[PDB]
Design an enzyme around this catalytic site. Structure first.
Site, PDB file in Angstrom:
ATOM      1  N   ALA A  61     -51.929  58.851 -58.817  1.00  0.00           N
ATOM      2  CA  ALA A  61     -49.976  58.727 -58.349  1.00  0.00           C
ATOM      3  C   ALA A  61     -50.744  57.216 -57.680  1.00  0.00           C
ATOM      4  O   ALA A  61     -51.253  57.113 -57.067  1.00  0.00           O
ATOM      5  CB  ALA A  61     -49.873  60.029 -57.645  1.00  0.00           C
ATOM      6  N   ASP A  62     -49.359  56.306 -57.552  1.00  0.00           N
ATOM      7  CA  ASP A  62     -49.468  54.947 -56.912  1.00  0.00           C
ATOM      8  C   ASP A  62     -48.022  55.115 -55.629  1.00  0.00           C
ATOM      9  O   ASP A  62     -47.139  55.509 -56.334  1.00  0.00           O
ATOM     10  CB  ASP A  62     -49.449  53.579 -57.149  1.00  0.00           C
ATOM     11  CG  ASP A  62     -49.976  52.601 -56.085  1.00  0.00           C
ATOM     12  OD1 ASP A  62     -50.394  52.964 -55.482  1.00  0.00           O
ATOM     13  OD2 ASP A  62     -48.711  51.713 -56.938  1.00  0.00           O
ATOM     14  N   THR A  63     -47.816  54.833 -54.487  1.00  0.00           N
ATOM     15  CA  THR A  63     -46.634  54.626 -54.075  1.00  0.00           C
ATOM     16  C   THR A  63     -46.491  53.563 -53.212  1.00  0.00           C
ATOM     17  O   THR A  63     -47.690  53.441 -52.735  1.00  0.00           O
ATOM     18  CB  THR A  63     -46.642  56.351 -52.940  1.00  0.00           C
ATOM     19  OG1 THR A  63     -46.192  57.646 -53.160  1.00  0.00           O
ATOM     20  CG2 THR A  63     -45.515  56.048 -51.367  1.00  0.00           C
TER      21      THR A  63
ATOM     22  N   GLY B 287     -45.239  56.176 -58.792  1.00  0.00           N
ATOM     23  CA  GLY B 287     -45.204  56.503 -60.336  1.00  0.00           C
ATOM     24  C   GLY B 287     -46.761  57.187 -60.389  1.00  0.00           C
ATOM     25  O   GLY B 287     -47.815  57.011 -59.948  1.00  0.00           O
TER      26      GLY B 287
END
Lengths: 204, 204
Positions: free
Chosen positions: B78-80, B115
């Site tokens: 995950a990437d915020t 994402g």
């Protein structure tokens, strides 16, 4: 509200947490308002919520006063309700009433109304005089199309048996809640931002 | 997921808190892949976030495979990120970096993109097969007009250090966030509801 005796008229732990996280220190005196009014006797749902919160706080102020002869400076009441297509959903009575609730929220967008009442109390001539300002907050919430697979596993939570409409948003509610629109702390129980905005116009 | 080993490729506790609160158990193995992806190589900010989440997950898949050569079954990356009028905001560098983030986010509305990459692995025949599915979720978030020395205090707490845009959702007891529009678990770090929607698509 530093020097003022503030008490909170709810036993809900989520309201305590929101207010205490905000730095406000208060006493917790849950209300004995076992009565609950008629929903059809109000024009709007947030009107029924703001009145139910008014009575909750006034029951607490008139009980502390007629028992301690102390008029607390401020008494805060709140009632959180949910509406689906106009129908008012309060908090469930048994696990399968949550189903009847949750099954209606499912796949649909609904409102979360929390009416708050800030009761300023003073004592004079052996009477408790009350000056009460009321307000509310609305937040829209969308439930994803819920199968009964996750429905029963979510009533088996034990979670929904105290919440308004039988659901929260933080623990296990993540599969339930597709999106929320508005003040998110209002969904959890207390419209904190609107509450702090109110106080400054009563004071200044 | 009923019989398979799951791996989460991030060190952030709120991502772990979310997924275990969702009743899904797994194992935390952070990724050694820097987020040095060139942002101009993308057209959209969510394309950048998804690609970053993919590489993070892929590195953990590789490292767990080039070690035991027993590929874990699915690895989640995950990437915020935060966007303010086209400008991408990620995890802060120092406190001055965390301070400027919030004071530009001040009183404005911004977008939060997370994402997610779900990497499916298979190693039965002495080699790693990886099939990935990417997706993202956006939430718009409005901040209230709060004074500088008070959010400079929030920076001194250490909370902004690990968060995209330098803020968590309970920042300042919850008075930093005025409104959210979209999934709010997307804001804290992980779009759980969308992740559940995907997981049933990968299978049935």
């Amino acid at each position: 509200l530093l020097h003022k005796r503030v008490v909170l008229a709810s036993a809900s732990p989520r309201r305590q947490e929101i207010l205490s996280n905000a730095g406000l220190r208060f006493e917790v005196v849950p209300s004995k308002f076992k009565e609950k009014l008629d929903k059809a006797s109000f024009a709007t749902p947030y009107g029924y919520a703001m009145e139910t919160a008014k009575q909750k706080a006034l029951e607490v102020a008139n009980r502390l006063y007629q028992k301690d002869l102390r008029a607390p400076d401020v008494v805060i009441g709140a009632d959180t309700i949910v509406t689906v297509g106009g129908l008012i959903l309060e908090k469930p009575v048994d696990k399968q009433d949550a189903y009847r609730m949750l099954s209606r929220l499912s796949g649909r967008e609904h409102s979360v109304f929390t009416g708050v009442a800030i009761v300023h109390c003073s004592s004079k001539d052996h009477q408790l005089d009350t000056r009460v300002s009321e307000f509310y907050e609305e937040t829209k919430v969308k439930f994803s199309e819920l199968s009964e697979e996750l429905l029963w596993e979510y009533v088996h939570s034990g979670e929904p048996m105290d919440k308004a409409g039988g659901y929260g948003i933080q623990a296990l509610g993540g599969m339930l809640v597709e999106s929320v629109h508005g003040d998110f702390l209002n969904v959890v129980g207390f419209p904190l931002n609107h509450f702090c905005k109110q106080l400054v116009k009563l004071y200044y």
